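Quarterly update, task 2.4: guanosine-5'-diphosphate-bound model.
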Amino acid sequence: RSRRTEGIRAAYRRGDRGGARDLLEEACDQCASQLEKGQLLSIPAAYGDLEMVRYLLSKRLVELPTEPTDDNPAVVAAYFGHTAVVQELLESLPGPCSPQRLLNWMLALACQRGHLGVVKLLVLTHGADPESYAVRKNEFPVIVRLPLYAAIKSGNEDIAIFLLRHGAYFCSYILLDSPDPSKHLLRKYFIEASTALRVKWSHLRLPWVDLDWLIDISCQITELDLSANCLATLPSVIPWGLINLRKLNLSDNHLGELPGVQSSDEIICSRLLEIDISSNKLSHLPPGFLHLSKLQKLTASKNCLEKLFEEENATNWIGLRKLQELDISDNKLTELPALFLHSFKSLNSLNVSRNNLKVFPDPWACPLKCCKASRNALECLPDKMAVFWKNHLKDVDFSENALKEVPLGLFQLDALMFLRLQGNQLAALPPQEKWTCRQLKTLDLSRNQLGVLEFPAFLSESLEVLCLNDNHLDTVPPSVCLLKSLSELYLGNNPGLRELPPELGQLGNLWQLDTEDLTISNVPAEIQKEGPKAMLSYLRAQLRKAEKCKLMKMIIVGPPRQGKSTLLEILQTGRAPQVVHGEATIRTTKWELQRPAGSRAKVESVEFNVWDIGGPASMATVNQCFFTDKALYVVVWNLALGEEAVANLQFWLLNIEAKAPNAVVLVVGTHLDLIEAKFRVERIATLRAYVLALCRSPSGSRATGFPDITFKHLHEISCKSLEGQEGLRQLIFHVTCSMKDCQRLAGRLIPRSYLSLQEAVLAEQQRRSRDDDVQYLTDRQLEQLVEQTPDNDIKDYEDLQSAISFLIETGTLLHFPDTSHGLRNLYFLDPIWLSECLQRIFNIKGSRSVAKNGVIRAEDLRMLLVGTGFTQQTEEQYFQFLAKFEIALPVANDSYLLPHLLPSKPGLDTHGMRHPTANTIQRVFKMSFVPVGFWQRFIARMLISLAEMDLQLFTIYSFTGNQRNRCSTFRVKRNQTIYWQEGLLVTFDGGYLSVESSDVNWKKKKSGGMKIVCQSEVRDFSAMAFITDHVNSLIDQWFPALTATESDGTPLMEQYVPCPVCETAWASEDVQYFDMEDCVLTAIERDFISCPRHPDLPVPLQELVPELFMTDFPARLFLENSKLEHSEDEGSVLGQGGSGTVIYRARYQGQPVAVKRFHIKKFADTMLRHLRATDAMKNFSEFRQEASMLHALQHPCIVALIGISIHPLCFALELAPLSSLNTVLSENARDSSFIPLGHMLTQKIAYQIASGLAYLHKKNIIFCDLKSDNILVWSLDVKEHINIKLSDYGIIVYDEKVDMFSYGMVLYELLSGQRPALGHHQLQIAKKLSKGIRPVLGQPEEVQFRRLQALMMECWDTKPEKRPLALSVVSQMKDPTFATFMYELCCGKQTAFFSSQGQEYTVVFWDGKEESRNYTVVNTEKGLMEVQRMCCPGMKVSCQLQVQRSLWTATEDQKIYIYTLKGMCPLNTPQQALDTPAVVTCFLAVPVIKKNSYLVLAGLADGLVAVFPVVRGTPKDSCSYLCSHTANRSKFSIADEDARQNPYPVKAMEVVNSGSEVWYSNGPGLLVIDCASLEICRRLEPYMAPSMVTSVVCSSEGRGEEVVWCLDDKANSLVMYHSTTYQLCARYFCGVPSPLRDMFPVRPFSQHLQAVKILAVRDLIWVPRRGGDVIVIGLEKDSGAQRGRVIAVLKARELTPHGVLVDAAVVAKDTVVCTFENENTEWCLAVWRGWGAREFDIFYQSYEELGRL
Ligand SMILES: Nc1nc2c(ncn2[C@@H]2O[C@H](COP(=O)(O)OP(=O)(O)O)[C@@H](O)[C@H]2O)c(=O)[nH]1
């Protein structure tokens, strides 16, 4: 029986796979049992036969037992590493019950074997546990069966570390049994090197650690993160025995205690900055922390602490002075000793929350920014809060404490802006009159027995949230209504609050109300159900004394000559008609209706302002404008014309629906007396239903696009017998009262000011009627009427906007809201005036001497229009009006085109212009009816567009997704045009287009329409797109009725294309046509479409509807779909466009690309087919517009287009490797303060954005959506040319100023690193920004980038006039001065100034005398006067020198006082004092490496040089006095009668040749001293008397050369010597008025130009001047010779107010400072970034190279 198995094994050993297959299948046929089948399955797994495994499991259905035995195929496959077999076997198991037992077995066995791939697949895909035991039933666990232990024991490092990193954890067994490789892995892979190796061993669950594991790297850092484990003790060395630790994370473990140090001298780690010992069992902090003078953060949170420290109240604790943050929350602290909190001085945040604290610690002076003391048992608060923390403490929370009252100081905090006192036993507040907390943004007083509550007035302009819910509040505190800036109020959970006072309606920005458990008597329950917004609106209505307005607007509509005026007459009078009605196009009147008996209406009667609109058919198109939403419409028709009349009604009905979607429409039949009575029941009931059939769906619902007419809205009436007049007016009243906005419209509450404005406007209309004026009310005049209104509550415009809405709804005002160029600034007062003026201008029957083919000269038109105003003062308005209605359009500036004056078809040469060519495309529009004036408007608009395009070839554009459209796709020079009333032929180079009304008769549907034909010899068919956009826009604007179907679904307009194949076959007949819908829908997918007459000869779409295929574009722009790896997966979505498109992450030709794709379909059915076709047409049009726009953009900062494709409809753009600027900026801004991306890089980003905006605006392209989201970052490397590009996708009136505003916003987000967080609701943000609120960025002192801050603040100025243009911004950023000056700091009156090496006293000033002598210390990095006029009595000083820890101070009493830095501020007691033969003028310190000492050379007022040896900052008394005169008489032998022996003061001192020598000044000459022998060795003569060397400077070059620069005080010239050869190499006259690109050779207002000092800044030399202009110079190599040149000229003009430069100095490796003095001896410090050759070079390279693209 078993022999079969052996055979199969033989079949595999011999390689006979086929024999194995057959034998195995036969054995399976015999082996029915599950056990036998599993035994068989073990065989191909043993071989590793993936194929036979698949056959066996797929066909024979062999089960895989989960038993982890030797016979298990999965165990065998894992044993031999056949990973594919492993996954196949595991996949075969059904259900979700993954065999974690078997998986763990395979894991452990593979780990023993080393088949790492099986392990990787087991854990990462199947989740085998790395920490379990692989132990069979009736088997005992051991450690060798644990995965990680065996992995390490096997010696395979890769598998072991993989397990450790992906779930496996250490244990005592690993650490004890195999310590060596364990320590190896720990010391090897978890090292973040930087020595400073930040070793992270957390989350490994180390039971213990040992110094032996990392003491070998205790030189700087052993390890930092030791958290997430069960440590119960630490080595004695951590942290104290480890010198350069900075931040330890010892939290999250069993460290109930810590080791310590016996004394501070044992703390080798004096520079630790952060300690986290949280989530531990600490009862007390170790005392050792109190010795860390450098510690910055300490978070001993989430502990069982009972005391902050042990009671060592005798030790002079020195540490924790600079501790800025202390988190001791989640503890059992009852007392916080005032001792150590007082000891802390830099403390900014005390998180003592969640403790047993009953007495808040005593207050002390320290810069607290927050105090989270919540969840304690505090009884009272400190009373010095407004004394110590007056201007520092911002966030405060003493909520849920044992408080009964608070001191005034709490509410006198000026910096306080978040206060949370909820959950306490507060009964009353301090009086508001003594409050000075003007920055309160949130104040929660909930859960308190307090109820009178009163607030300060200023709180109305600062508060944003207030929460008074759940208090002793039976009445709303009246002061609450005063908080206009409030946004969120909680008044709920107040059962005794039985009213909501009306004054709360004044709360302008309030939108959220907690109305829980409140009964509001004064508000209807319906309003309460509607919600808080309804409540506030109703309360505001109550406040403004709103009246019930019973006036409504109704319009009578219908075909002409149907007795509209008759119907109105019987409705008004209720009698037989009497009036003979005239020719007026419009009549206006008034009518009141009493409520019929039995009425349930809310009013006694209703009032109606009535417009009866009629007139000649020519004005019908314009009359449709008078229709408005929220009005009654009565459509009247003659019953006698029956079906015929009913048909026409659909037209009218659509017109009402297109303009008044919420209109109540009645349909009434007249001439009831003309129908035989006996048949009326049959005749009416039919016709009634018949008209319903013309407006109702087959299901009975409303036909889409039609008004909601129902059975109850129909009525019949007579005029002679007046049958049903009572019924008709009853119906009118019932629907009127039934109509609703929300409440019913009739009698709705209207604010009193609105009604007063209505009466004022009516009075103005009547005045103009009496004065024969023109019914044109401008915004100014409407505002004036508003101002003259008594009881006027309109303060902001939005109130007037709501008022205007009310007036237009009521029928007082007529408005046409077009915002183009201030066109909206008009309102109309009388329909009669408007209609009469329009009719008069229409009726200009100008002869051929007047209208020159439709255009009348401007002066002639002005004269012709005299009769209805048309004075010059109002002229513009009329044209602004007339252009809107398209009655007269500007033509150049020469004439005006009047569309109704187009000539008939002239007998011109249409044949010659026509091209009998094969590049023919034809389209045909079929129209059920032709709207009146359609053709004139269409032809006029298209002619205007052609003229505009002709002008453009020598301005309303857009960018990104928008509803703004422009036919940029048609850029064609126009050669010649023939145009007439019903068509036009327009010819251009290479072809033409033609439109003409045609007798369209497809399928015997003889109706209106047009034929359009396009020819272009180059296959450029943008003309057809032009025609289609004009058609779509015109129909949408002026004739919306045509974008609709009949009630049965028959479309009113269709568009066909004639088949070219059928025409060719014929070339009469109804040539077989394709419906445009199926054309476009098939063009989505296919390339060929089958004609019904030629089912076996499909025709290409490309020669049928080429506009869809972009056949006009260049060939190179097309993509190849086979080369496009497109992915529609959810993870491949890069973003979303503004048009519903999607930006996918794809690859083209292997390069990553962003494909913008259009998704057209939105789920046989004709209606769905039409909807899909329309959507496809829209998406194609937007595709074409976007493609044409993007194709014309070529700039280094605009996302370029790669190519396009049709199947699917999508195109490709270059992809951003680093995503958006928002991404990188957000992730870098978290851990910094300002300029997160760096100085140079941030300047680069700003310049790139400015260049992109300038380029876009130059092309008349407007962005409108400039955000960090749309900016795409490619490289943060400053050396690359391009770093960012502006994209058209993210991840009302617009102009360049809006883009510049958004640019200022982007600049703010760049500098701050935070978004302009004015809120999370956009409406509130917009309201704040419009009203002058802006987000806060720090002062220049902390930004350090002044000039761009100036630009950024200038960008969002409330007035667009002051907002700069993009070009000027680019020009500003061109100059290096834009991004070299950082800021300025004004120090006021002073007496002396001293620089430093940058170690301590970065800058210091001195003032006063004797008792008043004081000093000011300025730190440039923070821009703060860290010491402010600290007293230091004594005699004033001429020079100083600070080195090591000692400051030498040369007083004018010929004495040098040596102080130590260890005295901190009061350096009044000198450590040494040394006499001098004369007052020292200057100092120099030169170290000696061979001696570990320093030499302080003191340059005297006589020219002699004193040598003070110094050892570790300790001066020695063994001075020497090198005599200049001795050196002269000995060597230089200058005659005594020379001026050179005048005892010149020593001005200049510098080290030369790496401190080998010292060079100093002596009159015109220089003297060089040996540093080894101290003998004066050399003299040099750069200048001649009366000159003198004011300074000497030496620095290293990029070539390794060392050279010395020296400046003359008088000649104002700079000379350059070489250090070792001692020859003058260069002479440069510096007093150049305009030193632009000055160049001078180098050998191998008159006071403004005076140089003051020479500064060595990196590899460049900075020469500042009195005039504030500083020149930076370097040198370059040309053909071996050298040449010194100006690299840049800098001058911060904003330093002019601070007078003249008194001096300058280099104060840091990257910073330069200068001091400007005014006439009052008040100084200002102006600081420039310390750029070297590299920084200037890269800045210039960036600007120039971008300029060269
Ligand atoms: N017999 C009869 N004639 C009517 C009825 N309604 C209107 N008319 C006629 O309609 C004419 C007035 O139409 P008209 O006011 O010019 O309509 P308009 O073009 O909208 O102004 C009158 O001469 C009436 O004879 C009706 O119910 N019965």
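Highlight for this quarter: The longest strand covers residues 1681-1690.
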